[PDB]
């Protein structure tokens, strides 16, 4: 019984749509419990400057009462069959989701249909959620991680969408009013822009009937003015540099423009963000490390942590590293990441990517466990590729990832590029941009 | 043969600045050549009227070399 | 003394464009030239007068020393 | 909150091509890149055709100056010379002989004992012409000026220690290493000789 | 077809072996063509004063 | 003691980047010649530096082989006197300096190899001087020999006027009037005092023109690099 | 080839279960009776610096070799303890298993604890013990265990700090040799076949073999002045196993365990309703359950502000009160219950979660209870059960613990 | 981690060339330094290059200068890079004074007074290579300028003939001054390197006064590329002396041969000196326009004393801005007096402007310090 | 009282308001001031530390403000002045005692 | 080979809460668990 074959016989994603354009995704093995949801092409990047917040001040209201479950109603019937319910926003997907028995799905499908098709939007529950989302973005202050990463979207995609945080401006979140809640929900929230996923032990044709039962009402058609069509955004080689000598350790993130979700690049990409990988002082590894980065970083103590990336959105996105250091290491993190760019870049070894690559190989295969992040992964492959990619082609995909195809890919989107740099914290030390962007090539 | 020099510092002596200073110059000529036993000499006024004359001279004698 | 132990700073936020999106010479002439008078107007009256005190005493003494060394009319 | 940070307009300061903010910087960044390294790329250019005239320069300050050169070479006249006769002159601050060779000289030299010699060289390659045998009159031992037409062996004779060179300049019977020294020469005009 | 700055860039300037060896061909290039451009421009703003005008005159 | 300063004469080499005029030299040099070598000594310059300037090869051989020199000593310990080469230098008049001053009454004629670099005004200078000569003003006369030049210093010279209409044929028959022998001659001792001319302002031009490309392009890459700090924002957000 | 659990108990003890399920990855678990509890007041955070520890030299592999190896081929290493067991994972692609395995039984069997490499490690306990206490949960939790008992159970998961850089070689040697043995061991896997396993473990994992929890009831008082006071209040429930435990489970998720809805206000929750009657500012409670072999702790959580922790832990406490007068109705029961079923079935979802169940019976019980058997005993609590759980408690000597502005938190006596 | 911070030769570099945290706002007056490190640099090559050719007997002297001119190959490109590399040097080094006088530098103190022994170093060089072509200006400005010590009393007529090695400037005068001009520069360029060793104790100032600490951007890139492109400039300023006005600075007279009867006509020294010269020429006594000449460039160490000012910077300082001004204008015309006969009306100027630098200096530019702060409630 | 006039003309003429900068900004630092500074609390500390990157970024530039935007001579508070008094106020009572 | 839910710095100032949107979840409900690894960030469980 070979990894290959294993590959072979993984349960297939079912593909169904409605008259009004909602798809319906499934996949079914025999298990007692289940997820099922609703991905949506909707956040910040769908958001004008005046609207902005909507969709997360949304995300507040969902779960608030229907007009068919008033108030806590909602609530109380999720709680009393045993299930979760959940939500989260990004820039470009907004999705809900369920957490049920799977004798329970009927109802689970019921219930998410009610959420978001007949969300009360209370006057005074608006007015109460407004403070608590106040208070969110006060939270939020305080983590520099997050800080630092609303800080690279906004100096990387300046003057667009883009450059928005999911959040928004605190100016908007007290100024909103449910006319604008209701604007931005009949806009944005349409079947063909929507996708009813689901995973656990479910029939895929029972799913389908369930979703004409409840799900035939949302709207497929918009008026003779305007279709939703989100324009390219402009990456920009720029730094924010947040100085706060107070702060106890300083946060860095620095990326490229990435090629965002269509493009194949995006397998080699990983392969050597994989190589590079990440760490923090609690890993194992140590000195011992298989990463020379990692390696290094532990040995001399440079930093507490670090992580690559490759953030994915539309026709663009962020490929590059975050790392949180001591105010005297921030030039020799900074040193070494670049380092480790020019290396793959010039001389990848055929050793080391096919580390990479079995990394990566472990990496998708192991994180695809359980049924809600296989249900995540339905609802959200849909709206990004336009379907479920089988792992079997995830495989040949990373088996056709050479040394050469890694430097070639690296060289594309890294090798004398200009990135976006954000800085947070006391950040003195922080390379000068010229030295940065010099950083970005080798004299050789 | 006639030097183009001895020519052009004819032309330039005919000049307003030059005929005044070559006045000043024959002022003193039968100044000091008819008093008797004064020690002052003409070198000032002999020079006043070269400056003049040799910087009209130099302007156009080397267009005739 | 190395970056990183010069000095203590707090809530200051620096943004800036790499070379290669922006413009050597951006309204190099537009926004040059009423700079450069602007200076120029600044500085003229602690830094011209002097000079034009050297100018003349200097074009005051050289021919002064040219009349000097001419003989009197007695 | 963070949020409220918005990145100031840098439109009076961007390049043309990324003024437009609905689309990709990556179209111009072929080309942005290309203009500034141009720039870089033609000074290089520019500092190398400074530095190599610059450094040259220098180099040749090193080099033999003009008034070294001028006595560099000396020009002789061969109608001057008779058949026999040796003739000194002033090289280099040394003495320099040019000898007018008879058909006998030529002959008697020309099948002498190659072997027998301590510095082994046949005549017809110790000079260009046959007629004509130039050589720098230092006695190569420890330095005189040899005597011409005398000898053993009828060329020139040393009264130092007790070299013997024969019409060819060729050592023959003493305590002399090498041979009289054959200059660096060619014959420009029939009449005339460069040496040096 | 990509612009002629671009052209540039991903044929000569991007490999930095590759922008050194252009600095090399160029400056030959330029050197010659320089001098040789420079000193007509020299030899025109003093025509007929240089020994090289007058040569022939004696030969 | 007043002082008249030469005027400024347009010469053929006022210019930035105007070479000699090297027929003017040519002809300058048998001013020097034909004129002067009986008087003044001109040490620096050779025979050989005449090649590629004023005569050919051929021509400066013939100027070398025409003067005696001394030369020696030969083998008998003899100093003997033989014609002229290239090697050798412009023979000086008399051989040493107190012997220049008893064929002058005094005076002792200086050396023009550097005599345009030596004194102020130059070629413009001598020139003045050349063709100033004129009749005393009225109240003045000097020691039997020391004559009136309103160019020289103290207005009073021990050198008879030198040059004048036809103390020479030219050999490209150019009419020998005494503006023009000064003009030449002093065209001559110009290149005398400074061979380099002709070179110096063509590596002036080709440093104008090198200068003219790398200071703006040097300059842009400054603008290039400093970019970043000129179009920068600050933003003061405290707590 | 449809496939369920397959399970083996070996004559020397140790127990192999697997299922062989054809999934491209394969975890394998090593289950060793070894945590915390294990520990005397010698050699406490012993078994810290051990689970630290894996990827240190053995005998056929270097530390080296180790780390590359495995990283080598996409895997990965993780050492998990509870207060009663220490758990050895490796996750891969099923083509490496049998790598990953023999890297497995060298960390398990025949570590060298060598005297430099140890020293050196000694650090990483202020670290990881550092990074863990940021959690306040960690601090309340660790003290309310050492206030509830007089030995086992009350020893720390993290090395208390006169100990850090004073865990001995020996001690490390010592603690493998008396608690790593195949009469307290049980290896698990899925995505391998079950007579593969079986011949590791006989050839592999046959080693030689080598006190009861004492309750005591105390509080422990963190002052450190956080607007937030963290605390806990627990007594004496059952042991794992027992029928009583799964009235307590019940019990918990009556009184309300956790949220259901993001952003929700826990309309089920009758802990949570109770407080928010009387008190509005920020605030969080839930029921605590702790299950063990000897023994167990339930009680409830506190997170009030520091004025408001006495007016909060008290509103909880006459929340269960109320439960254990006899104030409990079906459609309540049958909700909780419907969570803990759901809530069971959820937590091995995954094959993670499974493997966790799985090897966790293994030690604790003789076999493997299906799903099926589980909730078919949950159903079996009746009203009355979980009513005599609310009792005990209420009359059960209480254990406590808080940290935080601890100004207005009661003490035990006073509540 | 680098092998620029680490390796023990490549770590001195790279904290003094490269990551050195220089202010981000300092102007044009501060390539200066740069610009003098390359003169020292600029000498030293073409004079070691001289000194191939040179020989320093009083009779061949002149004549193997003029030989280096005529027949070694660009000989004479590198004689008068050399010569007008001299003058660039000084104006380099009153640029670079100027600066440090108008922005309050010399409170860095050793590098200031370091700054001094420099300043008279160059001076001491620059006056004994005048001294090697052995022509007129040569020759009568070395005896006048070195016979001042002659009124030292008791000793000054020892002294005089000591230096000299014999009763007038002579044969053995020349040799040793070849001898002392060829050690010098590398004695500067070690001084120089001590000089900045103290500047990058404190790092720079600029043009506010006002610490910098708060904005620092790293010397590489931004003043690397500002220092090539003042290079850049420097040898443009040269190159236009050295091919097209090579004799501009320089006097005739030193183009005729040392004669020790024939004396010139209006003996000087170089350019750079006059202002000093005709301080000297001021005072009637012999003594005292020593000490006045002395106390002229000596006076530089006594500037940090007499700073009074609360700010340090003449930015922010009209009055100071004003005298500052007028003190470079009074210099201005000390170097066109020194340069002067010594007749009416030079005598009466001169007098006039050496009183005026001196009370600049010592009372004016101090009071006017102590007005501002009075100003400024201070 | 009478020499107002003066002191408004002199700050103007000085003109480090067209940077916005007060007073005690431009002031040079010795021991003294050091201290002082070392001394202010958080928000005029931090307020100081913008004035002068501001000024010092104006000063790299060779620009000024907008005249609306300039330190109005009347606004000039004198921040460091209670700070620095006492400083040297300490330091003379050491002084002293050092006889 | 996945990073974790959190990465971890030791000496890193703590993350605020404000309200009780954000504070439920934090009631530890069952006893702890410790996590090390060779990839994974070290985790402590309720
Ligand atoms: C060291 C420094 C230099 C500097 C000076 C000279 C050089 C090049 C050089 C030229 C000659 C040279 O010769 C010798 F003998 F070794 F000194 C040595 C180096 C480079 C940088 N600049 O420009 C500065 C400009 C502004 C502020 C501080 C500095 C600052 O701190």
């Known amino acids: 019984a070979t990894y290959a074959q294993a590959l072979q016989s993984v349960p297939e994603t079912q593909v169904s749509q409605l008259d009004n354009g909602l798809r319906v995704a499934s996949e079914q093995s025999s298990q007692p419990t289940c997820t099922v949801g609703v991905w949506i092409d909707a956040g910040s990047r769908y958001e004008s400057e005046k609207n902005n917040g909507a969709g997360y001040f949304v995300e507040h209201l969902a779960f608030k009462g229907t007009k068919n479950r008033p108030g806590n109603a909602l609530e109380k019937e999720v709680e009393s069959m045993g299930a979760h319910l959940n939500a989260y926003s990004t820039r470009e997907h907004t999705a809900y989701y369920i957490k049920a028995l799977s004798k329970d799905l009927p109802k689970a499908v019921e219930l998410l249909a009610d959420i978001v098709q007949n969300c009360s939007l209370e006057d005074s529950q608006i007015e109460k959620e407004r403070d608590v989302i106040l208070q969110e973005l006060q939270e939020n202050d305080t983590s520099m991680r997050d800080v630092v990463f609303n800080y690279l979207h906004a100096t990387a995609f300046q003057?667009?969408?883009?450059?928005?945080?999911?959040?928004?401006?605190?100016?908007?979140?007290?100024?909103?009013?449910?006319?604008?809640?209701?604007?931005?929900?009949?806009?944005?929230?349409?079947?063909?822009?929507?996708?009813?996923?689901?995973?656990?032990?479910?029939?895929?044709?029972?799913?389908?009937?369930?979703?004409?039962?409840?799900?035939?009402?949302?709207?497929?058609?918009?008026?003779?003015?305007?279709?939703?069509?989100?324009?390219?955004?402009?990456?920009?080689?720029?730094?924010?540099?947040?100085?706060?000598?107070?702060?106890?350790?300083?946060?860095?993130?620095?990326?490229?423009?990435?090629?965002?979700?269509?493009?194949?690049?995006?397998?080699?990409?990983?392969?050597?963000?994989?190589?590079?990988?990440?760490?923090?002082?609690?890993?194992?590894?140590?000195?011992?490390?298989?990463?020379?980065?990692?390696?290094?970083?532990?040995?001399?103590?440079?930093?507490?942590?670090?992580?690559?990336?490759?953030?994915?959105?539309?026709?663009?996105?962020?490929?590059?590293?975050?790392?949180?250091?001591?105010?005297?290491?921030?030039?020799?993190?900074?040193?070494?990441?670049?380092?480790?760019?020019?290396?793959?870049?010039?001389?990848?070894?055929?050793?080391?990517?096919?580390?990479?690559?079995?990394?990566?190989?472990?990496?998708?295969?192991?994180?695809?466990?359980?049924?809600?992040?296989?249900?995540?992964?339905?609802?959200?492959?849909?709206?990004?590729?336009?379907?479920?990619?089988?792992?079997?082609?995830?495989?040949?995909?990373?088996?056709?990832?050479?040394?050469?195809?890694?430097?070639?890919?690296?060289?594309?989107?890294?090798?004398?590029?200009?990135?976006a740099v954000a800085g947070f914290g006391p950040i003195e030390q922080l390379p000068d941009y010229n030295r940065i962007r010099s950083g970005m090539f080798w004299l050789r | 043969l006639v030097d183009p020099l001895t020519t052009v510092r004819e032309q330039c002596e005919q000049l307003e600045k030059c005929v005044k200073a070559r006045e000043r110059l024959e002022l003193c000529d039968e100044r000091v050549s008819s008093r008797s036993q004064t020690e002052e000499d003409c070198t000032e006024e002999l020079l006043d009227f070269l400056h003049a004359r040799d910087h009209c001279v130099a302007h156009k004698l080397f267009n005739s070399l | 003394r190395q970056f990183g132990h010069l000095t203590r700073v707090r809530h200051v936020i620096t943004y800036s464009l790499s070379p290669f999106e922006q413009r050597a010479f951006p309204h190099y002439f537009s926004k040059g030239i009423p700079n450069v008078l602007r200076r120029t107007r600044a500085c003229i009256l602690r830094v011209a007068p002097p000079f034009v005190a050297f100018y003349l005493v200097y074009t005051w003494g050289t021919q002064e020393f040219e009349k000097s060394k001419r003989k009197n009319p007695a | 909150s963070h949020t409220d940070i918005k990145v100031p307009d840098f439109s009076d300061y961007r390049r043309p091509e990324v003024l437009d903010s609905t689309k990709s910087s990556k179209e111009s960044s072929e080309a942005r890149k290309g203009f500034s390294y141009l720039v870089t790329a033609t000074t290089t250019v520019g500092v190398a055709y400074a530095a190599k005239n610059v450094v040259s320069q220098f180099v040749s300050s090193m080099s033999a100056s003009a008034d070294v050169l001028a006595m560099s070479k000396i020009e002789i006249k061969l109608s001057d010379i008779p058949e026999g006769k040796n003739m000194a002159f002033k090289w280099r601050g040394k003495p320099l002989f040019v000898r007018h060779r008879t058909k006998k000289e030529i002959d008697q030299e020309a099948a002498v004992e190659v072997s027998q010699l301590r510095d082994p060289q046949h005549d017809l390659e110790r000079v260009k012409k046959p007629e004509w045998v130039i050589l720098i009159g230092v006695c190569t031992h420890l330095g005189c000026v040899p005597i011409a037409n005398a000898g053993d062996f009828g060329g020139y004779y040393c009264p130092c220690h007790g070299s013997h060179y024969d019409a060819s300049g060729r050592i023959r019977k003493g305590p002399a290493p090498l041979n009289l020294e054959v200059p660096s020469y060619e014959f420009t005009s029939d009449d005339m000789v460069i040496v040096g | 077809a990509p612009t002629l700055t671009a052209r540039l860039y991903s044929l000569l300037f991007r490999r930095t072996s590759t922008f050194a060896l252009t600095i090399v061909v160029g400056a030959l290039f330029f050197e010659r063509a320089f001098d040789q451009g420079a000193d007509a421009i020299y030899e025109h703003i003093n025509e007929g004063k240089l020994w090289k005008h007058i040569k022939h005159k004696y030969e | 003691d007043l002082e008249l300063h030469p005027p400024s004469y347009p010469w053929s080499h006022r210019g930035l980047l105007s070479s000699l005029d090297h027929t003017s030299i040519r002809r300058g040099f048998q001013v020097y010649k034909q004129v002067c070598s009986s008087c003044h000594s001109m040490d620096?310059?050779?025979?050989?530096?005449?090649?590629?300037?004023?005569?050919?090869?051929?021509?400066?051989?013939?100027?070398?082989?025409?003067?005696?020199?001394?030369?020696?000593?030969?083998?008998?310990?003899?100093?003997?006197?033989?014609?002229?080469?290239?090697?050798?230098?412009?023979?000086?008049?008399?051989?040493?300096?107190?012997?220049?001053?008893?064929?002058?009454?005094?005076?002792?004629?200086?050396?023009?190899?550097?005599?345009?670099?030596?004194?102020?005004?130059?070629?413009?200078?001598?020139?003045?001087?050349?063709?100033?000569?004129?009749?005393?003003?009225?109240?003045?006369?000097?020691?039997?020999?020391?004559?009136?030049?309103?160019?020289?210093?103290?207005?009073?010279?021990?050198?008879?006027?030198?040059?004048?209409?036809?103390?020479?044929?030219?050999?490209?028959?150019?009419?020998?009037?005494?503006?023009?022998?000064?003009?030449?001659?002093?065209?001559?001792?110009?290149?005398?005092?400074?061979?380099?001319?002709?070179?110096?302002?063509?590596?002036?031009?080709?440093?104008?023109?090198?200068?003219?490309?790398?200071?703006?392009?040097?300059?842009?890459?400054?603008?290039?690099?400093?970019?970043?700090?000129?179009?920068?924002?600050?933003?003061?957000?405290?707590? | 080839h449809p496939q369920d659990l397959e399970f083996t108990r070996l004559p020397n003890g140790l127990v192999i279960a697997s299922l062989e399920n054809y999934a491209p990855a394969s975890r394998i678990g090593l289950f060793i009776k070894a945590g915390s509890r294990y520990e005397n007041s010698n050699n406490l955070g012993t078994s810290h610096l051990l689970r630290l520890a894996s990827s240190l030299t053995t005998k056929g592999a270097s530390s080296f070799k180790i780390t590359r190896g495995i990283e080598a081929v996409g895997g990965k290493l993780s050492v998990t303890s509870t207060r009663e067991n220490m758990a050895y994972t490796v996750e891969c692609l099923r083509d490496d298993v049998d790598i990953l395995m023999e890297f497995l039984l060298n960390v398990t069997t025949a570590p060298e604890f060598r005297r430099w490499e140890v020293a050196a490690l000694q650090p990483q306990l202020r670290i990881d013990k550092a990074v863990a206490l940021q959690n306040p949960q960690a601090h309340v939790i660790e003290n309310l265990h050492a206030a509830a008992y007089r030995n086992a159970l009350a020893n720390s998961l993290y090395c208390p700090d006169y100990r850090i850089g004073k865990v001995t070689p020996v001690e490390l040697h010592d603690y493998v040799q008396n608690h790593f043995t195949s009469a307290r061991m049980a290896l698990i896997g899925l995505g391998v076949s079950h007579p593969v396993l079986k011949q590791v473990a006989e050839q592999f994992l046959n080693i030689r073999g080598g006190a009861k929890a004492k309750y005591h009831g105390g509080e422990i008082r963190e002052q450190n002045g956080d607007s937030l006071v963290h605390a806990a209040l627990v007594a004496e429930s059952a042991a794992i196993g027992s029928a009583e435990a799964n009235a307590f489970s019940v019990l918990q998720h009556v009184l309300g365990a956790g949220p259901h809805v993001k952003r929700g206000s826990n309309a089920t929750s009758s802990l949570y309703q109770a407080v928010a009657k009387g008190v509005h500012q920020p605030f969080d409670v839930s029921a605590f359950n702790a299950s063990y072999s000897d023994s167990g702790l339930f009680g409830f959580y506190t997170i009030s502000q520091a004025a408001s922790a006495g007016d909060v832990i008290k509103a909880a406490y006459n929340q269960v009160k109320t439960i254990a007068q006899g104030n409990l109705s079906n459609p309540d029961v049958q909700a909780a219950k419907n969570k803990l079923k759901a809530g069971y079935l959820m937590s091995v979802e995954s094959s993670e979660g499974f493997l966790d169940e799985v090897g966790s019976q293994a030690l604790a019980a003789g076999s493997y209870t299906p799903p099926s058997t589980v909730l078919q005993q949950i159903d079996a609590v009746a009203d009355a059960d979980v009513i005599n759980a609310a009792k005990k408690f209420v009359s059960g000597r209480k254990s406590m613990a808080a940290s935080g502005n601890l100004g207005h938190t009661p003490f035990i006596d006073e509540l | 981690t680098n092998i620029r911070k680490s390796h023990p030769l490549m770590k001195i570099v790279n904290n003094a060339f490269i990551d050195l945290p220089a202010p981000s706002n300092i102007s044009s007056w501060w390539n200066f330094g740069s610009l003098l490190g390359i003169c020292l640099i600029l000498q030293i090559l073409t004079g070691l290059f001289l000194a191939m050719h040179y020989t320093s007997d009083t009779t061949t002297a002149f004549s193997s200068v003029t030989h280096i001119c005529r027949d070694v190959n660009y000989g004479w490109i590198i004689r008068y890079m050399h010569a007008n590399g001299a003058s660039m040097f000084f104006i380099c080094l009153y640029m670079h004074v100027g600066r440090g006088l108008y922005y309050g530098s010399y409170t860095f103190l050793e590098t200031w007074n370091i700054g001094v022994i420099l300043l008279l170093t160059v001076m001491a060089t620059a006056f004994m290579g005048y001294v090697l072509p052995w022509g007129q200006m040569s020759f009568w400005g070395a005896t006048v300028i070195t016979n001042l010590l002659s009124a030292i009393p008791y000793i000054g007529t020892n002294l005089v003939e000591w230096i000299w090695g014999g009763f007038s400037v002579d044969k053995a005068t020349l040799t040793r001054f070849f001898a002392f001009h060829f050690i010098l520069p590398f004695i500067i360029m070690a001084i120089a390197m001590v000089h900045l060793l103290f500047l990058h104790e404190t790092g720079s100032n600029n043009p506010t006064g006002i610490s910098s600490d708060v904005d620092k951007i790293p010397f590489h890139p931004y003043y690397t590329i500002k220092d090539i492109l003042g290079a850049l400039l420097l040898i443009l300023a040269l190159m236009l002396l050295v091919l097209f006005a090579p004799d501009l600075l320089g006097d005739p007279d030193n183009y005729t041969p040392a004669n020790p009867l024939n004396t010139p006509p209006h003996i000087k020294p170089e350019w750079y000196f006059l202002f000093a010269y005709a301080i000297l020429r001021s005072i009637p006594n012999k003594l005292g326009g020593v000490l006045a000449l002395a106390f002229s460039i000596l006076i530089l160490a006594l500037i940090p004393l007499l700073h009074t000012s609360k700010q340090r910077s003449m930015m922010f300082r009209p009055l100071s801005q004003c005298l500052f001004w007028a003190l470079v204008a009074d210099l201005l015309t000390l170097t066109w007096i020194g340069g002067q006969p010594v007749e009416h009306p030079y005598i009466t100027i001169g007098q006039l402007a050496s009183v005026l630098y001196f009370l600049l200096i010592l009372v004016l530019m101090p009071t006017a310090g102590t007005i501002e702060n009075k100003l400024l409630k201070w | 009282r009478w020499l107002e006039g003066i002191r408004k003309w002199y700050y103007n003429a000085a003109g480090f308001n067209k940077l916005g900068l007060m007073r005690d900004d431009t002031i040079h630092e010795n021991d003294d001031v050091k201290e002082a500074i070392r001394r202010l609390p958080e928000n005029l500390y931090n307020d100081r530390v913008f004035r002068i990157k501001r000024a010092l970024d104006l000063s790299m530039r060779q620009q000024i403000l907008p005249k609306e935007q300039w330190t109005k001579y009347e606004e000039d508070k004198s921040y460091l002045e209670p700070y620095l008094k006492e400083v040297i106020r300490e330091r003379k009572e050491r002084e002293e005692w050092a006889k | 080979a996945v990073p974790a839910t959190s990465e971890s710095p030791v000496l890193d100032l703590k993350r605020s809460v404000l309200c009780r949107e954000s504070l439920r979840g934090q009631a530890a409900g069952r006893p702890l668990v410790a996590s090390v690894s060779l990839n994974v960030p070290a985790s402590v469980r309720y």
């Open chain 1, 159 to 419: 003057g667009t969408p883009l450059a928005q945080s999911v959040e928004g401006p605190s100016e908007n979140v007290r100024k909103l009013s449910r006319a604008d809640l209701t604007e931005y929900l009949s806009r944005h929230y349409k079947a063909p822009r929507m996708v009813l996923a689901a995973a656990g032990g479910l029939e895929h044709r029972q799913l389908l009937d369930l979703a004409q039962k409840h799900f035939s009402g949302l709207s497929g058609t918009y008026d003779e003015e305007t279709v939703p069509t989100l324009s390219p955004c402009r990456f920009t080689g720029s730094q924010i540099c947040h100085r706060e000598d107070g702060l106890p350790l300083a946060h860095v993130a620095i990326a490229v423009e990435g090629p965002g979700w269509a493009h194949p690049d995006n397998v080699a990409l990983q392969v050597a963000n994989a190589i590079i990988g990440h760490y923090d002082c609690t890993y194992g590894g140590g000195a011992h490390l298989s990463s020379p980065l990692a390696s290094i970083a532990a040995t001399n103590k440079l930093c507490q942590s670090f992580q690559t990336f490759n953030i994915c959105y539309a026709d663009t996105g962020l490929l590059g590293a975050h790392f949180v250091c001591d105010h005297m290491s921030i030039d020799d993190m900074m040193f070494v990441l670049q380092g480790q760019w020019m290396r793959l870049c010039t001389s990848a070894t055929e050793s080391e990517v096919l580390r990479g690559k079995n990394l990566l190989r472990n990496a998708l295969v192991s994180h695809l466990d359980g049924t809600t992040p296989v249900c995540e992964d339905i609802g959200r492959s849909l709206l990004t590729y336009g379907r479920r990619i089988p792992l079997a082609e995830w495989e040949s995909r990373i088996a056709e990832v050479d040394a050469r195809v890694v430097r070639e890919v690296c060289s594309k989107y890294f090798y004398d590029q200009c990135p």
């Open chain 6, 44 to 239: 620096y310059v050779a025979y050989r530096h005449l090649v590629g300037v004023c005569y050919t090869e051929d021509e400066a051989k013939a100027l070398a082989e025409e003067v005696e020199v001394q030369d020696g000593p030969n083998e008998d310990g003899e100093m003997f006197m033989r014609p002229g080469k290239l090697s050798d230098y412009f023979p000086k008049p008399y051989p040493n300096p107190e012997a220049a001053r008893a064929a002058n009454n005094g005076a002792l004629p200086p050396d023009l190899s550097y005599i345009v670099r030596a004194r102020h005004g130059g070629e413009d200078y001598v020139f003045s001087l050349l063709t100033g000569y004129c009749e005393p003003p009225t109240g003045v006369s000097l020691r039997e020999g020391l004559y009136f030049n309103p160019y020289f210093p103290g207005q009073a010279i021990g050198m008879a006027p030198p040059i004048y209409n036809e103390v020479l044929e030219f050999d490209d028959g150019t009419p020998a009037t005494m503006s023009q022998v000064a003009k030449d001659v002093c065209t001559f001792l110009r290149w005398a005092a400074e061979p380099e001319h002709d070179h110096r302002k063509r590596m002036g031009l080709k440093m104008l023109l090198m200068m003219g490309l790398l200071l703006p392009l040097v300059y842009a890459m400054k603008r290039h690099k400093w970019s970043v700090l000129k179009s920068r924002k600050l933003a003061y957000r405290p707590p």
